[PDB]
Design a protein around this ligand. Structure first.
Ligand SMILES: [Zn+2]
Length: 304
């Protein structure tokens, strides 16, 4: 059975996407935007009060298989939205005014692999020509200074950038969706772990985005907001200097498409547990993250 305070396997998350949608048709619609290398369905949930020509915020979880708290967050967010609509003023206005396209798990094949074989797997599970080595790092597979820095051209490496930008069925599916909905998408949020950071472009180069000051101000306020709940401290800034230069990331790509508000969230913790964050921290991690996501949404809405 599905639980919002436990990490759920794919079979369970999939059944949940069906159930939550069927139980809240006036706030959620589910669609599949493609298939993974191994044939799993890439679901996308459109959360919001249906209406004509609504702007939207795109949010994904599960790019990297082992970052289990990421997958948990997308699920938590959906419940929060359906339960509080009509009661909490901010969420009510958010869902009335815009739609949140929530992609609960992008790298489903890798996620299944972490449950069945290797908990520390991070890449996709596609085969590579000329080698037994499996997988591509999806966050190094986008057309953003593709494979020019901080990425490997070797299939056996954990940071393999792929045979070409969008070589993976999963990243092509996401890029296609975003490209087909650019007019309505106002912000792009991608959830990962761990490190407790809010990063903005650019990661593939030390250059700064045109709206760098605004993004810094927004990230700074979002981390402040996040800390009000349990005291969790996040750092923030451009990817290249905050983490290190790494090309082919979805955040940089989305930004270069024209999406001015593009952020990568690195959830708890700082390394004590790393990727194996205990289930006992799911609730607090998700609750404080909600505050930052809602803060950003409120800002984006008032800046349309
Ligand atoms: Zn990651």
């Amino acid at each position: 059975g599905h639980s919002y305070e436990k990490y759920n396997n794919w079979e369970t998350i999939e059944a949940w996407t069906k159930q939550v949608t069927s139980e809240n048709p006036d706030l959620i619609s589910r669609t599949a935007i493609g298939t993974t290398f191994l044939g799993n369905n890439i679901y996308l949930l459109k959360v919001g009060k249906p209406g004509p020509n609504k702007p939207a915020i795109f949010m994904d979880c599960g790019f990297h298989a082992r970052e289990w708290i990421s997958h948990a967050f997308c699920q938590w967010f959906v419940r929060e939205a359906v339960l509080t609509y009509g009661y909490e003023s901010h969420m009510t206005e958010f869902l009335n005014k815009l739609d949140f396209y929530v992609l609960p798990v992008l790298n489903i094949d890798g996620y299944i692999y972490t449950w069945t074989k290797n908990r520390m797997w991070r890449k996709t599970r596609s085969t590579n020509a000329g080698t037994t080595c499996i997988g591509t790092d999806p966050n190094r597979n986008f057309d953003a200074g593709w494979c020019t820095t901080g990425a490997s051209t070797d299939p056996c490496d954990e940071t393999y950038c792929g045979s070409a930008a969008e070589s993976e069925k999963e990243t092509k599916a996401l890029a296609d969706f975003i490209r087909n909905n650019l007019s309505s998408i106002k912000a792009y949020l991608t959830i990962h772990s761990y490190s407790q950071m809010i990063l903005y472009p650019y990661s593939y180069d030390y250059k700064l985005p045109e709206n760098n000051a605004e993004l810094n101000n927004l990230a700074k306020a979002a981390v402040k907001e996040l800390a009000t709940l349990y005291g969790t401290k996040y750092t923030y800034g451009p990817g290249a200097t905050t983490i290190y230069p790494a090309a082919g990331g979805s955040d940089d790509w989305a930004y270069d498409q024209g999406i001015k508000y593009s952020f990568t969230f690195e959830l708890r913790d700082k390394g004590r547990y790393g990727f194996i964050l205990p289930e006992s921290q799911i609730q607090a991690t998700c609750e404080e993250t909600m505050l930052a996501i809602k803060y950003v949404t409120n800002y984006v809405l008032g800046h349309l």
